[PDB]
Coordinates of C-alpha atoms and ligand atoms in Angstrom, one line a residue:
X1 CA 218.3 127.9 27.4
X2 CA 218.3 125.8 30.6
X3 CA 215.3 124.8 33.0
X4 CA 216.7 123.9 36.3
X5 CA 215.0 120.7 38.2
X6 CA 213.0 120.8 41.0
X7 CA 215.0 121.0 44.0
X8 CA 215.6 117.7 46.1
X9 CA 214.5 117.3 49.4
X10 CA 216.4 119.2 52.4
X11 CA 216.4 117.7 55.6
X12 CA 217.3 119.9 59.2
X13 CA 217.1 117.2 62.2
X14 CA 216.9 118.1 65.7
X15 CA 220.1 117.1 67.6
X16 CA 217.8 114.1 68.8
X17 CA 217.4 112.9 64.8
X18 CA 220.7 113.9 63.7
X19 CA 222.6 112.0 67.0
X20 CA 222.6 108.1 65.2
X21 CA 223.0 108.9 61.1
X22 CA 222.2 105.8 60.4
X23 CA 218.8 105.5 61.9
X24 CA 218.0 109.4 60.4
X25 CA 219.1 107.5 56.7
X26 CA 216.5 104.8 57.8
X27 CA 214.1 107.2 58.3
X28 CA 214.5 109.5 55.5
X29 CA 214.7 106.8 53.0
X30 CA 211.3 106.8 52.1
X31 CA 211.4 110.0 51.1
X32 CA 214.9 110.4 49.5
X33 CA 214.7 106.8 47.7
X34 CA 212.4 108.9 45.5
X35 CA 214.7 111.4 44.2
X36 CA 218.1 109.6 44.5
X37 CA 219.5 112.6 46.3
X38 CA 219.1 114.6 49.5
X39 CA 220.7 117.5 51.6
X40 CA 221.0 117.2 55.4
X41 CA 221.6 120.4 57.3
X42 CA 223.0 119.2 60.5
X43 CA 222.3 121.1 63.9
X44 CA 223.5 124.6 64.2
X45 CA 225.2 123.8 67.0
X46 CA 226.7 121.2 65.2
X47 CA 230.1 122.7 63.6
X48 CA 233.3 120.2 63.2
X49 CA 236.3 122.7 63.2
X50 CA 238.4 122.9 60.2
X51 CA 242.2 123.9 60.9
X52 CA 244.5 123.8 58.1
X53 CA 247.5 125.7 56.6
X54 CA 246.8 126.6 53.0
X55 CA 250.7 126.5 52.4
X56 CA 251.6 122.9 53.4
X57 CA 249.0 121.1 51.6
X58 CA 250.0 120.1 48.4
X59 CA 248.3 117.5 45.7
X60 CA 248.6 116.6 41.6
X61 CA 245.7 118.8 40.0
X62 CA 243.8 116.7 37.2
X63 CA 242.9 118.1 34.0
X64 CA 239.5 118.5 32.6
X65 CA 238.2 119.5 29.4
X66 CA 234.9 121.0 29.7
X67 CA 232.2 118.9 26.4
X68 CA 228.9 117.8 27.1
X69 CA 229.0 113.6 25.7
X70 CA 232.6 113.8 25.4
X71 CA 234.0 110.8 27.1
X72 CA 236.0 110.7 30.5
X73 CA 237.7 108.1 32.5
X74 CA 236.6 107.8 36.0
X75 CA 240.0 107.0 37.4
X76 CA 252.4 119.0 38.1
X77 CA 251.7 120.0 41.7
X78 CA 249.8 122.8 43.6
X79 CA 249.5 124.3 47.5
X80 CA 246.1 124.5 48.3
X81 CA 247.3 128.1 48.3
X82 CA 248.2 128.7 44.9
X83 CA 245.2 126.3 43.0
X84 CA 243.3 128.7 45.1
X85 CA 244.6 131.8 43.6
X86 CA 244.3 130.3 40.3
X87 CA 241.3 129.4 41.2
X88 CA 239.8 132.8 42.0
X89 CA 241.5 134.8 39.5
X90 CA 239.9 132.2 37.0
X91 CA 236.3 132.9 37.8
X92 CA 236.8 136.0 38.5
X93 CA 238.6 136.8 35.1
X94 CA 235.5 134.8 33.4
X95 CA 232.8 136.7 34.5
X96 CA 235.0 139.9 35.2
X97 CA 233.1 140.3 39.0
X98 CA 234.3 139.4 42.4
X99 CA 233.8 135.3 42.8
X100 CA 231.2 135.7 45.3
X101 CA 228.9 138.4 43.1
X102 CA 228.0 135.8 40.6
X103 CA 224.4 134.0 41.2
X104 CA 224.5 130.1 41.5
X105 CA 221.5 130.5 38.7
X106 CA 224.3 132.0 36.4
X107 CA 227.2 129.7 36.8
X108 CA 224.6 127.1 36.3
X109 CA 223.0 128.7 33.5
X110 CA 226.5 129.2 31.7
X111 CA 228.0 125.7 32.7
X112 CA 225.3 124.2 30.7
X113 CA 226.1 127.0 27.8
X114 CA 229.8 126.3 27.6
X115 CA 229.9 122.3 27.9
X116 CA 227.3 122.6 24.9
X117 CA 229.0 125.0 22.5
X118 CA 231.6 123.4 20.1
X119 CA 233.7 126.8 20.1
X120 CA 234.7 126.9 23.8
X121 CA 237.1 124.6 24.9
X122 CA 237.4 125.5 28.6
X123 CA 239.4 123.5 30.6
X124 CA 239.8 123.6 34.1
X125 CA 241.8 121.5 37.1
X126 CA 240.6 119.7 40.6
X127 CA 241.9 117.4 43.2
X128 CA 240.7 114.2 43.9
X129 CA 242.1 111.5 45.8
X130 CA 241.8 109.6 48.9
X131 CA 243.2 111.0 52.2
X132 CA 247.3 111.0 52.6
X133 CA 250.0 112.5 54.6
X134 CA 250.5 115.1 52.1
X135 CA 246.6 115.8 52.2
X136 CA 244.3 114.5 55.0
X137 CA 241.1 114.3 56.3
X138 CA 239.1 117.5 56.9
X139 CA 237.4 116.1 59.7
X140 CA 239.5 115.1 63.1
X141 CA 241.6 112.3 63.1
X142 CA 243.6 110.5 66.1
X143 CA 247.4 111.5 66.1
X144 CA 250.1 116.1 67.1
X145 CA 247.8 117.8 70.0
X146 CA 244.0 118.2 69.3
X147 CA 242.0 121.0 70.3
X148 CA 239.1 119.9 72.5
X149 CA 236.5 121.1 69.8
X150 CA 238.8 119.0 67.2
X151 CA 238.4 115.9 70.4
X152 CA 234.8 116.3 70.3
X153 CA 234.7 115.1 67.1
X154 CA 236.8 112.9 66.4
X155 CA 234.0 109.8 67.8
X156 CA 231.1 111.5 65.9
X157 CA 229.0 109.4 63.5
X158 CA 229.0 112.3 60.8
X159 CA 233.2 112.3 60.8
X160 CA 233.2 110.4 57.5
X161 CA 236.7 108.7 58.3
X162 CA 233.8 106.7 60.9
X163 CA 231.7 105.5 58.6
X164 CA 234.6 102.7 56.9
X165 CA 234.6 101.6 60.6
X166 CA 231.0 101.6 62.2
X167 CA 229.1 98.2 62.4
X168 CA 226.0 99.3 60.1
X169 CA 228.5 99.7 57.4
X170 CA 228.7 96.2 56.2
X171 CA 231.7 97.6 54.2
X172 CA 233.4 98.1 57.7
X173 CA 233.3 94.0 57.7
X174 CA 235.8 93.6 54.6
X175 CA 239.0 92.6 55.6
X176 CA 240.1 92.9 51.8
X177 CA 242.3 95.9 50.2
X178 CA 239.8 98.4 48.9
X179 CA 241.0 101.2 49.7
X180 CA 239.8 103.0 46.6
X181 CA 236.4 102.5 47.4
X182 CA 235.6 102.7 52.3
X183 CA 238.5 105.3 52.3
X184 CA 236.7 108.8 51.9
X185 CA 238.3 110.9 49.0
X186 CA 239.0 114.5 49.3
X187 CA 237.8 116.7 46.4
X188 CA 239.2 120.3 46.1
X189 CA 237.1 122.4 43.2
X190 CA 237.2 125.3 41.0
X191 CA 234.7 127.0 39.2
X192 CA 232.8 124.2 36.6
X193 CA 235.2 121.9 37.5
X194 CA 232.7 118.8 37.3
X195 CA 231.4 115.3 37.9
X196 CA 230.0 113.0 35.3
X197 CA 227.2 111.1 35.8
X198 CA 227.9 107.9 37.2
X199 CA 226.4 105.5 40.2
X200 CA 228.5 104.1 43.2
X201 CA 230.6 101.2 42.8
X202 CA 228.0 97.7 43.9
X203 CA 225.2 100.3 44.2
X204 CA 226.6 101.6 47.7
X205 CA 225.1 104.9 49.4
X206 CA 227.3 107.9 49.1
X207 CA 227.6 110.8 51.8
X208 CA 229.4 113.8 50.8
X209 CA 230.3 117.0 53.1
X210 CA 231.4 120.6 51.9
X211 CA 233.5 121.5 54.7
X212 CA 233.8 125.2 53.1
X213 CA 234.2 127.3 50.0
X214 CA 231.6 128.2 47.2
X215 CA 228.8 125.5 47.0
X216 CA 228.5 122.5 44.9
X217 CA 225.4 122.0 42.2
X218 CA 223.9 118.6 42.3
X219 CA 222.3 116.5 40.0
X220 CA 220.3 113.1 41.5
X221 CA 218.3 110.6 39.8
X222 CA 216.0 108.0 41.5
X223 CA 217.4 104.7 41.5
X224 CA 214.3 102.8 39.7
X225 CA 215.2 105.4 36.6
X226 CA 218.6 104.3 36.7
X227 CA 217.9 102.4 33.6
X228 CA 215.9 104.7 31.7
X229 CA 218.4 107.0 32.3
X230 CA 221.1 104.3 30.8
X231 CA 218.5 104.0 27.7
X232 CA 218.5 107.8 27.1
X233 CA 222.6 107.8 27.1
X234 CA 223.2 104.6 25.5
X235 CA 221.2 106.2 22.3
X236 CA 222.7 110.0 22.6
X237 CA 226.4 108.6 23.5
X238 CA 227.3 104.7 22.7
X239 CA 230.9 105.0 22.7
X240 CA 230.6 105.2 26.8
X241 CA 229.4 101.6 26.5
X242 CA 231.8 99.5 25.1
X243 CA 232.7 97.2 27.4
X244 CA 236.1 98.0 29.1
X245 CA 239.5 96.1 30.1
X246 CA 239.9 97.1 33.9
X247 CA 237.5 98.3 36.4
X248 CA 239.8 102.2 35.7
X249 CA 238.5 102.2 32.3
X250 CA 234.9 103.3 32.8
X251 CA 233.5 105.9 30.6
X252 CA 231.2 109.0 32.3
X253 CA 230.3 112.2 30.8
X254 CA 228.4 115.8 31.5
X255 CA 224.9 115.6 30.2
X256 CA 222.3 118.2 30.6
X257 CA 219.5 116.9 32.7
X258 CA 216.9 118.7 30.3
X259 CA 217.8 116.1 28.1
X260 CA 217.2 113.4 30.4
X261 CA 214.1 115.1 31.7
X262 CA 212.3 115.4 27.8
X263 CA 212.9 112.0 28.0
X264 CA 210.9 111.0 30.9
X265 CA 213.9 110.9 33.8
X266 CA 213.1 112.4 36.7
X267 CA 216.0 114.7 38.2
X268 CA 216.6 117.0 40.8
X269 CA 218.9 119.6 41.8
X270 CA 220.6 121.6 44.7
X271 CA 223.3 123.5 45.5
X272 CA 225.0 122.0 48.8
X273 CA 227.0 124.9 50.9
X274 CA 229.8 124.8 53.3
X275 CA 228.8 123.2 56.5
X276 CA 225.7 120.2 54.7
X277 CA 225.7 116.9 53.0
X278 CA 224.5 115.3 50.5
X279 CA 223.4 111.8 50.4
X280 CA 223.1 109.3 47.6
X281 CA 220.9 106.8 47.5
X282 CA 221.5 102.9 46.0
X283 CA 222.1 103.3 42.3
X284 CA 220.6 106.8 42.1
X285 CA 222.4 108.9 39.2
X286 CA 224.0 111.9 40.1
X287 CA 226.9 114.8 38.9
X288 CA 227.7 118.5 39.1
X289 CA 230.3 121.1 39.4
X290 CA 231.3 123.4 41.9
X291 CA 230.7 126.9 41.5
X292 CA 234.3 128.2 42.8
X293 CA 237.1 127.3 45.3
X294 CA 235.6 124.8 47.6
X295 CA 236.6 121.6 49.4
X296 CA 234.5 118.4 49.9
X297 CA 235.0 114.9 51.6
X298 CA 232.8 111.9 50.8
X299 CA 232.9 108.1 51.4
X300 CA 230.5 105.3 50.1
X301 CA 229.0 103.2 52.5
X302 CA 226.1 100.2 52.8
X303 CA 223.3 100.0 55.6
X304 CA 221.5 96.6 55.9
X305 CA 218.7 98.0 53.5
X306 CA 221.5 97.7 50.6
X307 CA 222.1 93.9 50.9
X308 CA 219.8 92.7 48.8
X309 CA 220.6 95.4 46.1
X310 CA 224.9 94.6 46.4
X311 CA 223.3 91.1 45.6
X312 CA 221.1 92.5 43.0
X313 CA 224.0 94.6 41.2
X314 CA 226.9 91.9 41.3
X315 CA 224.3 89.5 38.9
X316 CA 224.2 93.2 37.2
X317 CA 227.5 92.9 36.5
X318 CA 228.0 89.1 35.4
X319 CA 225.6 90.2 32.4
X320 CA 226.9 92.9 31.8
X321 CA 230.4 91.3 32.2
X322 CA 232.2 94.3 34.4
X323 CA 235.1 93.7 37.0
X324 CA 233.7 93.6 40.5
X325 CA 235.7 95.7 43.5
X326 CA 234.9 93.0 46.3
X327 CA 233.1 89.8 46.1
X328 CA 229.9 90.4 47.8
X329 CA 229.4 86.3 49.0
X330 CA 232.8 86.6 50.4
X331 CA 231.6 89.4 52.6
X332 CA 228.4 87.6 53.8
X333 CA 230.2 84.7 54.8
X334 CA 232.9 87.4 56.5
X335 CA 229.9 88.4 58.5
X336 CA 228.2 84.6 58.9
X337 CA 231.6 84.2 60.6
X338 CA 231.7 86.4 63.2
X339 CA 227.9 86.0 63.8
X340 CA 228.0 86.1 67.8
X341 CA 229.8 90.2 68.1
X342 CA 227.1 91.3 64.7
X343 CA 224.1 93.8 65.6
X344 CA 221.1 91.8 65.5
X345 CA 219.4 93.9 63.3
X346 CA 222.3 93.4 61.0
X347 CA 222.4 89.4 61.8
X348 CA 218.7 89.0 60.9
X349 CA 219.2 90.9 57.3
X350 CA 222.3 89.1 56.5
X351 CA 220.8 85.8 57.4
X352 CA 218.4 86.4 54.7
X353 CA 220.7 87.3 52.3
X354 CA 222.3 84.2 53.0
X355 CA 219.7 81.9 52.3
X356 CA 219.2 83.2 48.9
X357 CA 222.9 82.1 48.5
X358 CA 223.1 79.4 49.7
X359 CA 219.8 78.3 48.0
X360 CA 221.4 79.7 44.2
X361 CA 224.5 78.3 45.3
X362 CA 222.8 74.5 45.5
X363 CA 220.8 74.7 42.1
X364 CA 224.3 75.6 40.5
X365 CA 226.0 72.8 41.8
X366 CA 223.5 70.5 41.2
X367 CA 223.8 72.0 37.5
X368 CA 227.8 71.7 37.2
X369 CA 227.1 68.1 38.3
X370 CA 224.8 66.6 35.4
X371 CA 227.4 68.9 33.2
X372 CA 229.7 66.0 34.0
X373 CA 231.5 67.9 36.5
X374 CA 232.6 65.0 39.4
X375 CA 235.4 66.1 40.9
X376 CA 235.9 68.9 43.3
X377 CA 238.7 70.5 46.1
X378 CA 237.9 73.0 48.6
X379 CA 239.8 76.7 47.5
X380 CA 240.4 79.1 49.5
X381 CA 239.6 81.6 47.2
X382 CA 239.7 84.5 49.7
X383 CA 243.8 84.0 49.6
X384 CA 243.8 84.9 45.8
X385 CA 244.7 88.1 44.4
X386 CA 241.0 89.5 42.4
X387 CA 242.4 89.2 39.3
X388 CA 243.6 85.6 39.9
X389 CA 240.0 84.7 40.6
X390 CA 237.5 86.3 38.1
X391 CA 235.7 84.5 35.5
X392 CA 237.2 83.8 32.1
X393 CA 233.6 84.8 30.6
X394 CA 231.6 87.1 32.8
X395 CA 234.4 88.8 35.1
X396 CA 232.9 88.2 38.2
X397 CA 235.1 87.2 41.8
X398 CA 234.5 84.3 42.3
X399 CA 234.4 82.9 46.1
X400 CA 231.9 80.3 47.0
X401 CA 232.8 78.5 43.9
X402 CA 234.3 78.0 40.4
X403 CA 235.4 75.2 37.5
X404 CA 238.7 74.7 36.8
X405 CA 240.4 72.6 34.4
X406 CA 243.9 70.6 33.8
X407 CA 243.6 71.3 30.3
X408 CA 243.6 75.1 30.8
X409 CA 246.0 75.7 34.3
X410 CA 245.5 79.2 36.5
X411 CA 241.9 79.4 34.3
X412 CA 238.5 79.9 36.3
X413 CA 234.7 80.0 35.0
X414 CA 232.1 80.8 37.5
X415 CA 229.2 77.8 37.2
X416 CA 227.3 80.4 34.9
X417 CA 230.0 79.6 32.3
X418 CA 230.9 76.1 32.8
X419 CA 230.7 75.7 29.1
X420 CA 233.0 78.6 28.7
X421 CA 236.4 77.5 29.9
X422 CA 237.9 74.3 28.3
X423 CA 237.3 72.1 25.2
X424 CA 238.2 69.4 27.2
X425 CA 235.8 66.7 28.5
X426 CA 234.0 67.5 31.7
X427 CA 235.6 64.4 33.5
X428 CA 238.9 66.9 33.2
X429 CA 237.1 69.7 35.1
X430 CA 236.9 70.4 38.8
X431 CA 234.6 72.1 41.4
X432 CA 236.6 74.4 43.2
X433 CA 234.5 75.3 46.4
X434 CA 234.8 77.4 49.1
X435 CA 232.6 75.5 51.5
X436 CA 230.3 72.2 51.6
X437 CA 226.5 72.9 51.7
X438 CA 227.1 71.3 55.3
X439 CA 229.6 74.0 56.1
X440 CA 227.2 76.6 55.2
X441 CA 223.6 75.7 56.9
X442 CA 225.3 76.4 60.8
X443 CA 226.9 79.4 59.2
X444 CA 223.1 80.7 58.8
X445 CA 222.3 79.0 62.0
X446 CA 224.8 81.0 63.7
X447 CA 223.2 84.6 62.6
X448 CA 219.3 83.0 63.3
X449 CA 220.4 82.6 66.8
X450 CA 221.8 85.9 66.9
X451 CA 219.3 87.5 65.3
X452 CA 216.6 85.6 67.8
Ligands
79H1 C1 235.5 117.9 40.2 C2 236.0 116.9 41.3 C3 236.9 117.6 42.3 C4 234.9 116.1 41.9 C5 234.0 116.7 42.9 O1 234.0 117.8 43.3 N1 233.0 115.8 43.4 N2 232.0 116.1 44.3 C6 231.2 115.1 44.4 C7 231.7 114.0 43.6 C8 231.0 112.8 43.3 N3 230.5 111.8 43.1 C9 232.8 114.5 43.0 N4 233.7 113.9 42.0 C10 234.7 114.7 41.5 C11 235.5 113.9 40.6 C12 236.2 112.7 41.0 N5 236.8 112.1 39.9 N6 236.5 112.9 38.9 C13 237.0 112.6 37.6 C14 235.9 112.0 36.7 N7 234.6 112.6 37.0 C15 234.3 113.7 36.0 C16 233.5 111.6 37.0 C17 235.8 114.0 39.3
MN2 MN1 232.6 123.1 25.1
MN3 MN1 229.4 109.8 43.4
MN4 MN1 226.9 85.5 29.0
ZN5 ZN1 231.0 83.8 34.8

């Protein structure tokens, strides 16, 4: 028996809200924040055409076994034709009715049946991976001839492939290789095919659109439950918690949200259609599965409210010892550096984020120092590959800092693990530093000027 959660808050902006999305996030965020995930119907007016022949677009379907707690990794070839057909004549078969006769109440009801029961093993395939030649973008992109409905939307704020590239996206600001996390992925579903739980890499926002096919079901969590929620499936499924080699190693799984609700989390639900979004907030929980044939875009992204969390989660991950995808530092000083073309708004809430640095970054220097740390050399660490520059100990990137040592060559410790690098004496080690406390105070400067 399953008792579905209260539905999340649905959103329908005028074309005057829904013209900046950024300032329509800004405003819903008090109400959102609370439930970790929204829907946004946009204008009806508002329609982005989707053109696309079902016979030339061809990707790798991934296999998925279908257990609630079983473990998953969060890392053969079909037309978007043929999966289709398979597709249909799977859900179809299953519930021996036409794909679109079966209630959203009773794929959800019998998603949560089957992932629970030990006899069914019911495995199903999906696509997921970031745009590519042999698979693009939904939504308009510049290139062939465009339609002028396709031209009108190729500048909008709601084409995803725009969010990696607008100014409020401090993530637009990273001149560093991650694709895997501002490129929007392109997700095509079948019937129960299905997300774990899991939040967004450095606790980034996530916007999601269904651009047509059967809807998706949504689960969202509040990010202040994120971890009560961790609590409830650190006790019902530790093996997801041993600590893992690389950042593609991550362990999610399907869990009822009954479960998480008997246990105090608060969840809600919806089912997003063809034509809305879906929204998730800073470290707010969510999964699903899509109840037939469907295709979705989404793409993570970070307003200026998120700063201070991406600071908040990277300390997260030091004690928790997990790989980081960017160094966050090393993208505030991107910023601090080209201070004078920033959005004010965006200058100002930097700035402060910068003073916390640069304040943490002076206590641990002044640490390393009566460690017996003396000497020191300026590193460029933005020119290292990640993996050449993560602490020995905690796994974090390291850029404003680090300890190195003769006694142990290529080796770095952030200054949290000083202690954890050589057996050496400290006279041996040295302070490897981006820049000199003097560098950094008219870095700040720079953005409080801007900023007014
Ligand atoms: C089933 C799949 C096409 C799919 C999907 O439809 N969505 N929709 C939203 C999200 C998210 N977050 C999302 N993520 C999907 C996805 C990716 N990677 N994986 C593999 C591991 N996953 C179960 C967490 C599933
Ligand atoms: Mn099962
Ligand atoms: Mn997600
Ligand atoms: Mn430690
Ligand atoms: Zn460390």
């Amino acid at each position: 028996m399953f008792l579905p959660p209260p539905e999340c808050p649905v959103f329908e902006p005028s074309w005057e809200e829904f013209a900046d999305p950024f300032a329509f996030i800004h405003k819903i965020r008090p109400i959102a924040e609370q439930t970790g995930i929204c829907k946004v119907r946009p204008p009806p007016d508002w329609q982005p055409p989707f053109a696309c022949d079902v016979d030339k677009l061809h990707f790798t379907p991934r296999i998925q076994r279908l257990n609630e707690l079983e473990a998953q990794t969060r890392v053969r070839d079909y037309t978007l034709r043929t999966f289709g057909e398979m597709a249909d004549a799977f859900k179809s078969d299953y519930f021996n009715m036409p794909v679109h006769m079966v209630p959203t109440e009773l794929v959800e009801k019998e998603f949560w049946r089957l992932v629970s029961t030990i006899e069914e093993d019911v495995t199903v395939e999906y696509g997921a991976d970031i745009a590519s030649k042999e698979f693009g973008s939904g939504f308009p992109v510049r290139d062939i001839k465009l339609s002028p409905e396709e031209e009108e939307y190729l500048d909008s704020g709601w084409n995803l492939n725009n969010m990696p590239v607008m100014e409020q996206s401090v993530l637009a600001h990273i001149t560093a290789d991650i694709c895997g996390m501002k490129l929007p992925w392109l997700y095509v579903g079948m019937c129960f095919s299905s997300f774990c739980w899991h939040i967004e890499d450095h606790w980034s926002y996530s916007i999601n659109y269904l651009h047509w096919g059967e809807p998706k079901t949504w689960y969202g969590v509040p990010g202040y439950a994120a971890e009560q929620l961790e609590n409830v499936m650190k006790k019902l499924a530790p093996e997801l918690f041993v600590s893992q080699p690389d950042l593609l190693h991550q362990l999610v799984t399907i869990m009822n949200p009954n479960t998480l609700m008997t246990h105090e989390v608060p969840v809600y639900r919806t089912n997003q259609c063809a034509g809305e979004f879906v929204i998730t907030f800073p470290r707010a929980y969510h999964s699903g599965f899509n109840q037939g044939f469907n295709f979705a875009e989404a793409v993570n992204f970070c307003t200026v409210d998120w700063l201070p969390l991406g600071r908040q989660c990277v300390e997260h991950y030091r004690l928790l010892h997990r790989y980081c995808v960017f160094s966050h530092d090393e993208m505030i000083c991107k910023m601090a550096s080209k201070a004078d073309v920033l959005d004010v708004v965006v200058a100002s809430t930097v700035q402060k984020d910068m003073a916390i640095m640069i304040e943490d970054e002076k206590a641990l220097r002044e640490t390393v120092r009566k460690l017996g740390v003396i000497d020191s050399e300026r590193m460029d660490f933005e020119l290292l590959p990640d993996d050449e520059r993560q602490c020995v100990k905690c796994k974090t990137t390291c850029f404003m800092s680090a300890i190195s040592c003769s006694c142990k060559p290529g080796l770095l410790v952030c200054l949290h693990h000083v202690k954890e690098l050589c057996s050496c004496p400290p006279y041996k080690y040295k302070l490897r530093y981006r820049y000199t406390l003097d560098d950094l105070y008219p870095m700040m400067n720079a953005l409080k000027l801007r900023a007014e």
